[PDB]
Amino acid sequence: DKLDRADILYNIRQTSRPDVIPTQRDRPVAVSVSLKFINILEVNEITNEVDVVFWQQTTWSDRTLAWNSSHSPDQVSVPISSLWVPDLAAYNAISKPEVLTPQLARVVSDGEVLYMPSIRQRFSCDVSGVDTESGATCRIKIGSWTHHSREISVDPSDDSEYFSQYSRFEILDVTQKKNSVTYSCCPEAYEDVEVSLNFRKK
Amino acid sequence: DDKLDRADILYNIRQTSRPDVIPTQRDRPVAVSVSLKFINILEVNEITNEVDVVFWQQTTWSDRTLAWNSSHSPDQVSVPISSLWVPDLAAYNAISKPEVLTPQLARVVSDGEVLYMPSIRQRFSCDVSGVDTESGATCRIKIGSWTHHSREISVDPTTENSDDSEYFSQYSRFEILDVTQKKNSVTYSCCPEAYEDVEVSLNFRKK
Amino acid sequence: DYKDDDDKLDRADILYNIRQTSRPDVIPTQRDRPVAVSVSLKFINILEVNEITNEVDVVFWQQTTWSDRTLAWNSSHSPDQVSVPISSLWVPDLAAYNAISKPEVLTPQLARVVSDGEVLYMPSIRQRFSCDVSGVDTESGATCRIKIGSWTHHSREISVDPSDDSEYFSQYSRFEILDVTQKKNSVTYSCCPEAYEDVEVSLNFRKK
Amino acid sequence: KLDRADILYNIRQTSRPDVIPTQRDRPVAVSVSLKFINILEVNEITNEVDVVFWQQTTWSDRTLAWNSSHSPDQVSVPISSLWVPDLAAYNAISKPEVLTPQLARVVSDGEVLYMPSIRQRFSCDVSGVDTESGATCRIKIGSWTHHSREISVDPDSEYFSQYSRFEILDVTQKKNSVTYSCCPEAYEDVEVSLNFRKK
Amino acid sequence: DKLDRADILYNIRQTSRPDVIPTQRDRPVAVSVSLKFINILEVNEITNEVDVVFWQQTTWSDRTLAWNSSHSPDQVSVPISSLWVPDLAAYNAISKPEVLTPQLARVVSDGEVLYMPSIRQRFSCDVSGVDTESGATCRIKIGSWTHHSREISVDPTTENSDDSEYFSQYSRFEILDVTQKKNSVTYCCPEAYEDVEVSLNFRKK
Ligand SMILES: *[C@@H]1O[C@H](CO)[C@@H](O)[C@H](O)[C@H]1NC(C)=O
Ligand SMILES: *[C@@H]1O[C@H](CO)[C@@H](O)[C@H](O)[C@H]1NC(C)=O
Ligand SMILES: CN1CCC[C@H]1c1cncc(F)c1
Ligand SMILES: CN1CCC[C@H]1c1cncc(F)c1
Ligand SMILES: CN1CCC[C@H]1c1cncc(F)c1
Ligand SMILES: CN1CCC[C@H]1c1cncc(F)c1
Ligand SMILES: CN1CCC[C@H]1c1cncc(F)c1
């Protein structure tokens, strides 16, 4: 139903505060992050650099966006410029994230938001072992760039489902674990997810 | 060529157009047609399984709320796509952004049919095995909505495919053997719902 | 008239008038005739030539002219012309059909508007084309053809109308120009029942 | 949350992003510190380095301060809502490519912290990268258009990537003042000396 | 005085017409341009192409911007979007000018504007001689892209003794001479565009 959709969008834009974190109660916003690797385009064992493509499945809640969907759309697509989005960054990225897909999020009637862009990006990590049976394991650390743990908490197979069958590489395993970083710059602590990409030449 | 009519039609389109809302009529998905007309193959990396291609992405759909009586006014106008809803199509196996080489205008017809046909340069990760053999390489490109499931958006091939190579450059060092563009459906771990795509199979070889 | 061209308040008023009456998204068809667009490519440099891939990298000044009589003003005592950001004007939606890269505009995106309604837009463009590079090393040279036309307006809406470019081409190029010729064409495409006009620019050139 | 929204609205009511936040007829004291993360490419024939670093930048605008006794201490703010120093690297030969979200932190006392991850290429002396004492690459950073009476600039094993082909021996960052041909006044700058070598 | 600054910026934005040439009386705008070379990055003797970095020192007046500064700041930095800037282009440039510095101009209380971006750009020019002792002489013409001489005059700055003063010692090249002179180009039609012709005499070290 189109008018319903347009009304939901209007509602979302009236209540959405894109530059403000949506803390519910005084708890931090829980953001779920899962990288789905699609391809591995270039590897350099010499420089320890990696060029990759992945779907960054990112979800969280803003209960204030919720509506009653008994007689209306459960979900709509929304431009992320209308929404708050976690300021995630990869601490070992050496190129800026090149978003390859339309910048739309899904908002579910319960206030859940799913943003899943396809990103091409290059990293500085441990490429040693590529041409080995065991293969290399390359570790990507992703976290909020400016919100510490009291403001944002970050939580998280072989990706047979998504990985290209045409890549000069294959994935042996991927694991994602929660992890904390604290830096000389800032007293408050930051949460990251450590994504371990275990892969080898095909 | 009545200009003031063109200006009024544009006014009405922008009054009516909701660029961020899918134009569903009744309770039926928006029926989007996509077809890739191939113009060039620029680079083919046998090492890495990548191809850089140029194609006109013929995209059509209807938004009957935009329609107008054209018995004594212009049948069609050109419109900037930022005034229009445009389907959120993406190539699921692309490895670069789609580079639009042409003016980002769509044609809106008086019955509310919309035609957007950019020329795109884009790189894909696909099977490049066989490119220098007689029977050639076959690269597969999947195009579908990035965020709308099939209850929301249907995507189908266009009726005419016989023109898929008609505009391919005779100066390309590659030549096209066959193209097929066929309906397919994709489901995933993330989302319980299904997405429609047109799978394009591009069979080509080095001259 | 000349004697009033540098009247600043007059220039600002002309700009105001243009922005009031300009419809940047609506083609300026006068009476019931197509907008007559004149296109002339003035080649400046041939940068990269590849005889294998049949690709050429070039720089040219794209002299584009057309008229919109609604922009017109009486200049017998005010500026004859002004510079205008093209984002304030309607501009033909020209595209080069055999381009294989985005046209990189290298100059300020300003057009000239003349008091009689004429609009003159001439960007410096760098762009890569897919065209015929065979024979670039011979005496008679290669002939690279570039096809330029409106991307979405057919012939009833926009019509297109078109030397050795001695005057413009870089003396320091590795290549030289024999001839540049430009012919009108009209074509119907598989997508659409109507016919689109284009210009074919034949760039006859050789390695020095 | 509502308190966050209101602080942000106050910041945007009082912030003049194109006006330097001078207090008391004193220049804005900007403190800079580069935390090198990666050395990506060293071209010995052209004397060019490609590097990734965290540009820790801080200053105060006390007209942004609020009473935090019963509201948050800090928020994140888009830098387009804030004045930021117009720092530039004088020996840069590419645009700064900002790799991170363009958010600053604003602290309830009016302190602003902006720390982008930046990838940029520099013209500097890479002679010696294949020696044990290494090469020393000097990066000169300062305000591009604000002289000393307007802006003053004042000055990595934990940060530097272990996977880099390179290794840092020593980073030093020293104040410097200069007077240029265009203009009578003097501009302050920080000279960042990066001593590094190939493993 | 910060408030004074915000007021000056407000006055400038009340008065400045960013798209209209600031002709004073009935005369052309006098723009002064000078390139201070910082670097020469790549040079190709076959293709006759150079890649250079330079500060594009640009100045002109808009008296309507002027204000009394006896008890207020004599200078402010303004974003160039708030100002009219001349539409300069290098007639033999073969890439877009990559601005490397913050896009801020200085406005001085007497109405003088200084805009001086650091630009990286590639040109087509005579690279023959670059490996000989006498070196190559590459010529760059800079002028208004759309304003003829009766609207904008382009002249060198008074000072060009400093053209190579900030040149990188770590360049694989070196500059022997720089000359920056008045020129006029004319084409079909009677209008002439004034330009500054920069002759860069350089060689490989
Ligand atoms: C323009 O103005 C002059 C008066 O200065 C008048 O004589 C002339 O007829 C006008 N032109 C038109 C077309 O109205
Ligand atoms: C801060 O607010 C608290 C109560 O909200 C009050 O006790 C205190 O006096 C205030 N301090 C300042 C500096 O305004
Ligand atoms: C600790 N955060 C995460 C990485 C860098 C650092 C940071 C960046 N911008 C503003 C901050 F307050 C802190
Ligand atoms: C006439 N153009 C040239 C090829 C395709 C066709 C076209 C492109 N976009 C919108 C159209 F209506 C038509
Ligand atoms: C259905 N799309 C195709 C790929 C992934 C999935 C998707 C992408 N972005 C947001 C979604 F909700 C779903
Ligand atoms: C100074 N340029 C060089 C050629 C002519 C002149 C020019 C360029 N673009 C638009 C014009 F109106 C004039
Ligand atoms: C301090 N910068 C370095 C070069 C010149 C000076 C500068 C740059 N832009 C505008 C100025 F006013 C001054």
Tell me the domains of chain D and their CATH numbers. Answer: 1-199 (2.70.170.10)
Asked whether the beta carbons of E92 and E139 are under 8 A apart, the reply is yes
- Considering only CA atoms, give the Rg of chain D: 19
Q: Which of D58, D75, D43 is nearest to D111 (CA)?
A: D58
DSSP states of E162-186? TTTTT--TTSSEEEEEEEEEEEEEE
Span from the CA of D91 to the centroid of ligand 3 (angstroms): 26
- Looking at this protein, which amino acid is placed at residue A28? P
With beta carbons less than 8 A apart as the criterion, state whether E167 and E39 touch.
yes
Residue C29: exposure state from Cβ atoms within 10 A (0-12, 13-18, ≥19): buried
Cα of A200 vs its chain's centroid, Å: 24
DSSP string, E91-122: TTB-S--EE-S--EEEEETTSEEEE--EEEEE
Look at residue C16 and give its three-state secondary structure: helix
In terms of DSSP H, where are the helices of A58-107?
none
The closest of C67, C62, C73 to C30, measured between CA atoms, is C67
Q: Name the residue of chain A whose CA is nearest to D56's CA.
A: A185
Residue E36 CA to chain centroid, in angstroms? 9
| Closest C-alpha among D85, D99, D114 to residue D52 | D99
DSSP-assigned letter for residue C18: H
Contact B107/B61 with Cβ under 8 angstroms? no
The terminus-to-terminus CA distance of chain C in angstroms comes to 46
Residue E155, C-beta contacts closer than 8 angstroms, at least 6 positions apart: E30, E31, E32, E33, E182, E194, E196
CA distance E19 to B103: 25
Q: Which of B161, B126, B166 is nearest to B142 (CA)?
A: B126
Structure tokens given for D136: 């020393």
Residues preceding discontinuities in chain A at C–N > 2.5 Å? 156
Q: Are E60 and E113 in contact (CB under 8 A)?
A: yes
Q: Which of D88, D94, D100 is nearest to D121 (CA)?
A: D94
Helix (H) or strand (E) holding A10: helix A2-15
Nearest CA to ligand 4 atom 10: C152
Nearest CA to CA, how far is A93 from chain D (Å)? 8
Residue D184, C-beta contacts closer than 8 angstroms, at least 6 positions apart: none
How far is E22 from E32, CA to CA, in rounded Å?
A: 14
DSSP A114-130: EE--EEEEEEE---TTT
Nearest one of E179, E97, E172, E167 to E137, comparing CA atoms: E179
Tell me which residue in B7, B40, B106 faces C26 most closely, judged by beta carbons: B7
DSSP at A144? E
Contact A122, A50 (CB under 8 A): yes
Sign for the CA dihedral angle at B119, B121, B127, B128 comes to: positive
Question: Which token pair is D186?
Answer: 């003097």
**Length of chain C in residues, anyone?**
208
Sign of CA dihedral D4, D9, D13, D17: positive
CA nearest E163: which of E115, E113, E201, E203? E201
The nearest alpha carbon in chain C to E149 belongs to C6
Q: How far apart are CA C129 and CA C169, in angstroms?
A: 18
- The answer to whether A87 and A20 are in contact (CB under 8 A) is no
* Angstrom distances, CA of residue E197 to CA of B97, B180, E5, E34: 40, 57, 37, 10
Q: Which residues contact A35 (CB under 8 A, 6 or more apart)?
A: A54, A55, A56, A57, A140, A142, A174, A176, A195
Question: Measured in whole angstroms, how far is the alpha carbon of residue C94 from the centre of its chain?
Answer: 8
How many Å separate Cα C92 from the centre of its chain?
9
Length of chain B: 207
From first CA to last CA, the distance across chain E in angstroms is 49
Distance CA B53, CA B60 (A): 21
E124 vs C contacts (CB less than 8 Å): 44-45, 47, 59, 170, 172-173
Which C residues 99-158 touch B at CB under 8 Å? 99-103, 130-133, 151-153, 156-157
List, in sequence order, every residue forming a beta bridge with E89; answer none if it has no partner. E143
Can you name the residues that pair with A153 across neighbouring β-strands? A30
Q: Among A174, A159, A78, A99, which Cα is nearest to B189's?
A: A159
Contacts of E145 in chain C (CB under 8 A): 107-108, 110
Distance CA E40, CA E51 (A): 6
DSSP string, A37-64: EEEEEEEETTTTEEEEEEEEEEEEE-GG
Q: How many CB atoms within 10 Å of residue C90?
A: 18
Q: How far apart are CA B200 and CA E71, in angstroms?
A: 72
Provide CB contacts within 8 A for C51, sequence distance 6+. C133, C134, C136, C137
Nearest Cα of chain A lies from the Cα of B188 at a distance, in angstroms, of: 8
Conformational region of residue A129, where left means phi above 0, alpha means psi within -120 to 50, and beta covers everything else: left
Residue C82's CB is within 10 A of a number of other CB atoms, namely 28
The residues, any chain, with a CB within 8 Å of residue B16's CB and separated by 6 or more, are B65, B66
**Alpha-carbon span B161 to B180, nearest angstrom:** 8
Three-state secondary-structure class, residue E147: coil
Quick one: which H or E segment has residue E131? Answer: none
Residue C168's SS3 state is coil
Residue type at C71?
L
Distance CA A155, CA A31 (A): 6
Residue closest via CA to ligand 5's atom 5 equals: B146
Residue where the block lists tokens 């300062």: D142
Beta bridge partners of E183: E195
Q: Quote the CA–CA distance of C134 and C179 in Å, as a whole number.
A: 16
Q: Are strands C118-121 and C94-96 parallel, antiparallel or unpaired?
A: unpaired
Distance CA A108, CA D5 (A): 23
C-alpha span between D177 and A185 (Å, rounded): 26
Measured in Å, residue A141 CA sits from the centre of ligand 4 at 45
**Tokens 């399984």, residue?**
B49
Alpha helices in chain B (DSSP H): 3-16
Q: State the burial class of residue B176 (Cβ atoms within 10 Å of its Cβ: 0-12, 13-18, 19+).
A: middle
- H/E segment holding residue E6: helix E2-15
> What token pair was written down for E126?
């005579």
- Cα separation of B84 and D83, whole Å? 36
Residue pair B157/B34 in contact by the 8 Å Cβ criterion: yes
Q: Which of A87, A88, A146 to mutate to test the pocket of ligand 3 (most atoms within 8 A of CB)?
A: A146
DSSP codes, C61-81: EEEEEEE-GGG----TTS-SE
Which residue type is seen at B173?
A: R
Q: Report the relative pairing of strands A112-115 and A104-108 from DSSP bridges.
A: antiparallel
Query: Other CB atoms closer than 10 Å to residue A26's CB: what's the count?
Result: 7
CB atoms within 10 A of CB E143: 27
The three-state secondary structure class of C87 is helix
Query: Taking a C-beta distance cutoff of 8 angstroms, is the pair B197, B156 a contact?
Result: no
Q: How far is CA C199 from the centre of its chain?
A: 11
* Minimal Cβ distance to B172: which of C99, C130, C192: C130
Determine how many CB atoms are found less than 10 A away from the CB of residue E42.
Answer: 12
Does residue C186 sit in helix, strand or coil? Answer: strand
Instruction: Say how far apart CA D48 and CA D92 lie, in whole Å.
Output: 10
Residue pair B97/A96 in contact by the 8 Å Cβ criterion: no
Give phi and psi for E119, each to the nearest 5: -115, 140
Nearest to C149 by CA among C138, C160, C139: C160
The token pair at D3 is 């308190």
For chain D, what is the HEC assignment?
A: CHHHHHHHHHHHHHCCCCCCCCECCECEEEEEEEEEEEEEEEECCCCEEEEEEEEEEEEECHHHCCCCCCCCCEEEEEHHHCCCCCEEECCECCCCEECCCCEEEEECCCEEEECCEEEEEEECCCCCCCCCCCEEEEEEEEECCCCCCCEEEECCCCCCCCCCCEEEEEEEEEEEEEECCCCCCEEEEEEEEEEEEEC
> How far are the Cα atoms of B66, B67, B73, B109, C194 from residue B76, in angstroms, in the given order?
11, 10, 9, 4, 11
- For residue B85, the one-letter residue type is W
- Beta pairing class for B113-116 and B194-206: unpaired
| SS3 (DSSP) at C56 | strand
On the CB side of E62, CA atoms within 13 Å amount to 21
Can you tell me the distance from the alpha carbon of C47 to that of C58, in angstroms, rounded to the nearest whole number? 6
Q: How many CB atoms lie within 10 A of CB E135?
A: 19
Quick one: how far is CA C44 from the chain centroid? 14
Cβ burial A116-152 (10 Å sphere, 16+ → b, else e)? bbbbbbbbbbbbebbeeeebbbbbbbbbbbbbbbebb
**How far apart are alpha carbons B38 and B203 in whole angstroms?**
11
Instruction: Find the angle CA(B17)-CA(B18)-CA(B24) to the nearest 5 degrees.
Output: 95
CA–centroid distance, residue D70 to ligand 2 (Å): 9
CA dihedral A17, A22, A25, A29 (to 10 degrees): 180
Q: Quote the CA–CA distance of B14 and B17 in Å, as a whole number.
A: 5
HSE (CB half, 13 Å, CA atoms) of A28?
A: 16
Q: What are phi and psi of D39, to 5 degrees?
A: -105, 115
For residue B93, the chain A residues in CB contact (below 8 A) are 38, 164
Resolution in A: 2.4
| E187 Cβ contact partners less than 8 Å away, ≥ 6 residues apart | C167
Structure tokens at E37: 């070379």
- Cβ–Cβ < 8 Å for E179, E199: yes
In which residue are the tokens 């240029």 written?
A: D180
Q: Which helix (H) or strand (E) holds C14?
A: helix C8-21
Residue B194 near residue B182, CB atoms below 8 Å: no
Length of chain D: 199
**Which of D1, D76, D159 lies nearest to residue A23, judging by beta carbons?**
D1
Token readout for B76 is 């069609």
Instruction: Give the up-direction half-sphere exposure of residue E130: CA atoms within 13 A in the CB hemisphere.
Output: 20
Beta bridge partners of B203: B138, B178
Neighbours of B35 (CB within 10 A): 26
